[PDB]
Amino acid sequence: VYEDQVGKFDWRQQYVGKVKFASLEFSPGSKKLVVATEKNVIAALNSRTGEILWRHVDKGTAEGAVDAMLLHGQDVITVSNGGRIMRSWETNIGGLNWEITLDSGSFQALGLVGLQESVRYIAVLKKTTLALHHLSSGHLKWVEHLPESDSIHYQMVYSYGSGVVWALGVVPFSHVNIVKFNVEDGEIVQQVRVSTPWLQHLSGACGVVDEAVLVCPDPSSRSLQTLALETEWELRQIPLQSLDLEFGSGFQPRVLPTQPNPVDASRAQFFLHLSPSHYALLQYHYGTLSLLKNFPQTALVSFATTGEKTVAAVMACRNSFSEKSSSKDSLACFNQTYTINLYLVETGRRLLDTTITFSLEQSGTRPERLYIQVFLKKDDSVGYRALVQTEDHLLLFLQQLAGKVVLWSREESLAEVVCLEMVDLPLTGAQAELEGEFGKKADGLLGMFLKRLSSQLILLQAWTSHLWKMFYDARINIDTLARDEFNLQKMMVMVTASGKLFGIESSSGTILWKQYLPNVKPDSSFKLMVQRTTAHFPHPPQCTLLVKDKESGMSSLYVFNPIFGKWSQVAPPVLKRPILQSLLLPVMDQDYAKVLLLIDDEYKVTAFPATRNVLRQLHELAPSIFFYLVDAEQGRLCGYRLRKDLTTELSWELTIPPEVQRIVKVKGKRSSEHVHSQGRVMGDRSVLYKSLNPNLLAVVTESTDAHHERTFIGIFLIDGVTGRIIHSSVQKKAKGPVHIVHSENWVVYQYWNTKARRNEFTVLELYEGTEQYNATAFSSLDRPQLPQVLQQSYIFPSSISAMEATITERGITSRHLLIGLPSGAILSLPKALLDPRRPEIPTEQSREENLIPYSPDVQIHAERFINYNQTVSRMRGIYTAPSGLESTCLVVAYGLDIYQTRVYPSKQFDVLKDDYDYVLISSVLFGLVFATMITKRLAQVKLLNRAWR
């Protein structure tokens, strides 16, 4: 069936990380565009269309990061990790050309060295070790040590086409040593010693210009040092009088040199960074300096070469411009508009054809990085493509001259997703009309009759209009966003760690709205929750978002709309210390909304929707709400509770030794979960009652000490109501990543054994006896009993990156467990297979009722593969949302890409069967009538003939 419906109601969107090292070479340039991002993934985009041709993902915990990336005519070279493994890739195809291992050093810089004709070797300089490898094949022959390496920092390695390799060594505050070697064999020629007390950094700063000219700025005395590595003896200090001498007080000055690798020689032009934004192109001939084109604003600049001519692109904030403290605004209609202009490098000419103008929509984002791809065409036309990078995470491409400046934009901030939720659609016009027409407060019989008559008349008019439309025929999604009989299209909100809110649809998958936060630093805690639903009219939907930091300790709450995007005019303030925890109260008040309260570090309850009836209901509840807090470093499990109005009191306390055990993860019970059957059939006919706990938390603790044999891992089951451990399970030979999922009454946690290289699967289930309790009111104050705990063991030959369970509204269908694999395919397996009631020896009644003999051998069937073709490179998490029919769950797997589908728990029992031929049914239906009418006359004539004869 899956082959027939390839892409009917599923979609996958592939993304990549933030662009770090992107090049815009390939003079032929059919569609190739290489990008190496900061998440250990190297991708290739298309200039024309924009799709991904070939991408590769190695790592992403802490190793395999890209450090440097060089580019030859057809072959690309890059170094991963920190100087251990280096592999070279291709652009015409996708794969590995060659690989090379390095020694144990600290990667600082690499470059290309050409013997006499072209590049034959690459030079890699580490903290102390210096090496040189081949570019075509992989061979290490040139490797040697430097004179002084301990108190010496080597950076900014420059190479010449003559055949001499130069190396610059600048210590933080002392002297400077420039060394040089040959290219044929390792031979130290001579060493230059120069004293410079104001030379502090050299990694990114000083550049090489002209032909071995070292130029360095100095804001202390506001001067320039120029020295010759090739010839001369010492440096020559140059004062800054011919141009405007304006160096920022608290700013280190930067140089922007450029030297084409294919060309043995270099250029004599370079940009100087001044203050926040002050660039100036100047040329150094021998001792005289010519400055021209004193750029006033020049927010960003870029260099480019195509042939013997050099181009410099300048990005300015122009469109009525009004410059603020650091940002730039344009007061005409759209605001935040920028222009790109081309300039000559040899002279200071400005092209009259190159004039790019584009504006952004969101406010706050500013350009960060930009590349330029000039190419010669025709005879007297210069064409170039600019790729401006948005401040947070976004890519954009511009054309030279067309109808629209923006060609393709890819959202690169949709990779790292922290929290995600799904909300429904408001209503349908006819449905809303019917709901409003039914609404009656107090009326008599005559009134209801009149209303019914009016509704009937409206229905008749609608039917007449419909029939007219049929007779005639016989002869923006944001605006509509209507619902249907089975709600399958839902609006999902995604939150990025960067701080961007994305609203995408479930059916199509197009970006509807996207909002930006003022400022979000890395590793921030996010939490989204929906208070007001969309089923009602009287007030717009309300969605709240909590965000807190780690370093400073700031907590903020936002109240926005998940349907449109505009935020409401209601927001409480936050004071004291950052918000610790939040809880959603099921009781509703005010109009149709839920009440939210938060706990401060001063142990106080703050209510979000301040309302007299809200506080009255909260006070009437009083000793009914409990709060448990969990600590990892402190290792202290606390329980507080509300008393009378608003105050904490310690009720139950637990402590765990941090040195022995360590807290890792804590899962609980979902709020939206309903259990249909409260008992289970047993061998003969007897009922068995279960043990359902709405208030029960599970703690997973591991061992701090890691050894081959000594490994401690266990699960604690504690009630949040009263401190009382139900069951404490412990293993002895398990370690590594452990995943725990909690369900109706069964816990599923997986581990890895060191004694035997395998992954063991433990299923825990809680069961009561044959007699039931009160069974009308459940409370944890009472119920002084201990439920039976059942454990079983299985084998799963995989890693299980993610695990989730399909959750349905009523809970009548089966309970499938979705498991992700490192490959990317997601497999769904039934819970019945992993049942604790698996008899070892085949028993008569056991095999008679419903049971399969126990066998610890779980194989991965290829038929039970939801992901047939579309795969997820990194499965961070999977979210399952219950649909509305009965047996339909929407599964969305997030991570490096996005993919959405529908999972069928047990085939289908709510929708009409697909293979249902109506021709046969209609033919039979008509033939029955035809045969009845045929036989009627036969019977009549038979009766008449029998009577007469």
């Binding site: 809970g811 009548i812 029992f909 009627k936």
Partner: protein
């Protein structure tokens, strides 16, 4: 109320099944009428039947008859010298029913095996729709009927109230059992359950399986019966009143002559 269903499964299953069973019953009735064939009746058997009717009528209505003529009839029937039933003897067929075997056969034959053809129809209908949910029955049911009721849905938590198309049509068969006679009449032969079972008034009521034995049985039955002249009691009308002849004589004026 749960398990929200589509509006396309009710218009493509319920109505088709209802019309299917309705027209199947009607077609069966019409074909049963068409296939009915007359049985040949021989003159001697006809005469035997008429003599039997005459003797039975004598047995029933014998009070309002003269005693002399009644004894003449009874002698003509009995007549120890010649005897009509005694002399007139036709061919005899060897029998086979026996006391205990037939006493048991009265129940053994019955109508036990007349449900299978309807089961065939239900099986075909269920084969057409494998995984389907037609309707729910308000009547609470026990979980031991779920295998017979659902028969194609893999659900153990679901209640047995939700029925499949098989039981839906099965209940549809007997729902119109008393409705078929409403349009046809008292003598209806549209019963879908009893397909092979012949249900009719019955051609040739008289069935003289053994003419001689029936003759002897009627001969002894007519000897047993007595005579009680119900005419001898005429005094009851003697002392009475005559007011009904005044009765419609009033209402016989009102009609004129056409």
């Amino acid at each position: 109320p749960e398990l929200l269903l589509d509006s396309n499964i009710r218009l493509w299953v319920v109505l088709p099944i209802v019309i299917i069973t309705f027209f199947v019953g009607m077609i069966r009735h019409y074909v049963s009428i068409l296939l009915q064939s007359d049985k040949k009746l021989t003159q001697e058997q006809v005469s035997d039947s008429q003599v039997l009717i005459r003797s039975r009528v004598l047995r029933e209505n014998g009070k309002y008859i003269p005693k002399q003529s009644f004894l003449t009839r009874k002698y003509y029937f009995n007549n120890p010298e010649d005897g009509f039933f005694k002399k007139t003897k036709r061919k005899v067929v060897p029998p086979s029913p026996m006391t205990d075997p037939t006493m048991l056969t009265d129940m053994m034959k019955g109508n036990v095996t007349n449900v299978l053809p309807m089961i065939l129809i239900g099986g075909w209908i269920n084969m057409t729709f494998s995984g389907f949910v037609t309707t729910k029955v308000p009547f609470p049911l026990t979980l031991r009927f779920k295998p017979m009721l659902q028969q194609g849905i893999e659900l153990l938590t679901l209640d047995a109230s939700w029925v499949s198309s098989a039981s839906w049509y099965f209940l549809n068969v007997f729902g119109l059992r008393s409705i078929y006679s409403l349009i046809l009449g008292q003598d209806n032969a549209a019963d879908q359950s009893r397909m092979m079972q012949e249900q009719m008034t019955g051609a040739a009521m008289a069935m003289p399986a053994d003419t001689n034995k029936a003759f002897k049985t009627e001969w002894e039955a007519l000897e047993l019966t007595d005579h009680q002249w119900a005419l001898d009691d005429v005094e009851e009308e003697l002392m009475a009143k005559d007011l009904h002849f005044e009765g419609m004589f009033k209402k016989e004026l009102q009609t004129s002559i056409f």
